[PDB]
Write a protein that binds this ligand. Structure first.
Ligand SMILES: *[C@](=O)([C]([C]C1=[C][N]C2=C1[C]=[C][C]=[C]2)[N]C(=O)[C]1[C][C][C]N1C(=O)[C]([C]C1=[C][C]=[C][C]=[C]1)[N][C])C(F)(F)C(F)(F)F
Ligand code: NA
Lengths: 10, 250, 28
């Protein structure tokens, strides 16, 4: 249930 | 953490979260010891019995966190790893002896109110503070029970236990590179680390210069918060020569 | 490091966290 992190970090 | 409490903001600015890129998941705890060095348990990366063997590219390091699951915009910083260094004599086969590993970050992190490194002990600090009865502090986002998962970082203060008691509580062979901590059944207080807390810091505050020092790394236990059982930690000072070494070169 | 172990929101402001006294009180 983790929130998505920005693609910049993959 | 079992029987702990929510951490205050900025209370453990050295706390790091090991995060798996895919599937996105919490792997372990860790600590910031410099702008580009993170200290953790070797078993967080390498543990053959569970088919665990992570390479630099499989992971991300999330620094400055409080919330376990939310991407804390403008507060946390996510770093990629340049290299992983596992102690050459780490014993994953038997008792997790020398359970320690260093991770070098691709780029240095900028410190802030929520990101700041912990100190590593020196001979005298270790001698003075590492005494049965003295309390340390463990923090992590691990399981709240077992033997569920918290919303925010948890914290628990635990007393160091005498070596003989540590040995007599388990069938596992204990070495000098470990120490155990927890309350005895007759003390009326509880608390322990648990699954997911692995790799996190056991810190103590020096009464001489008022700095926080990392004395241990959450390593293993047999059931979280069981009477007569204790958590075991990697003795950071006993392995300090290796740390200086790896940071000296590389 | 160099300023390691001194937390920006506590030691640096001379503010103590909720349970640190428990630790100091055990260092007998
Ligand atoms: C890791 O979080 C946990 C930390 C942990 C679980 N319970 C506990 C802990 C620390 C202090 C007190 C209580 N570590 C483990 O589960 C480790 C990893 C390998 C096996 N293990 C154990 O604790 C075993 C006991 C053992 C000891 C030595 C050799 C073999 C077996 N008991 C469960 C984590 F490992 F779970 C992880 F990194 F998050 F995965
Ligand atoms: Na024993």
């Amino acid at each position: 249930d983790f929130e998505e992190i920005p693609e910049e970090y993959l | 953490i079992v029987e702990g409490s929510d951490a205050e903001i900025g209370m453990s600015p050295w706390q790091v979260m090991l995060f798996r890129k895919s599937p996105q998941e919490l792997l372990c705890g860790a600590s910031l010891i410099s702008d580009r060095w993170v200290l953790t348990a070797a078993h967080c990366l390498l543990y053959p019995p569970w088919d665990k063997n992570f390479t630099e590219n499989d992971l991300l390091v999330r620094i400055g966190k409080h919330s376990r699951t939310r991407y804390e915009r403008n507060i946390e910083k996510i770093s990629m790893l340049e290299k992983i260094y596992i102690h050459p004599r780490y014993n994953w086969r038997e008792n997790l002896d020398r359970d320690i590993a260093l991770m070098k970050l691709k780029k240095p992190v900028a410190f802030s109110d929520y990101i700041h490194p912990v100190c590593l002990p020196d001979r005298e600090t270790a001698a003075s503070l590492l005494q049965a009865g003295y309390k340390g502090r463990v923090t992590g986002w691990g399981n709240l029970k077992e033997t569920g998962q918290p919303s925010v970082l948890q914290v628990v203060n635990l007393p160091i236990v005498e070596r003989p008691v540590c040995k007599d509580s388990t069938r596992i062979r204990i070495t000098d590179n470990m120490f155990c901590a927890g309350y005895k059944p007759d003390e009326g207080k509880r608390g322990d680390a648990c699954e997911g807390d692995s790799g996190g810091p056991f810190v103590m505050k020096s009464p001489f210069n008022n700095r926080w020092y990392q004395m241990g790394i959450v390593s293993w236990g047999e059931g979280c918060d069981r009477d007569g059982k204790y958590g075991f930690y990697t003795h950071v000072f006993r392995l300090k020569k290796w740390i200086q070494k790896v940071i000296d070169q590389f | 490091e160099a300023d390691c172990g001194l937390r920006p929101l506590f030691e640096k402001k001379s503010l103590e966290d909720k349970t640190e006294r428990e630790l100091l009180e055990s260092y007998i």
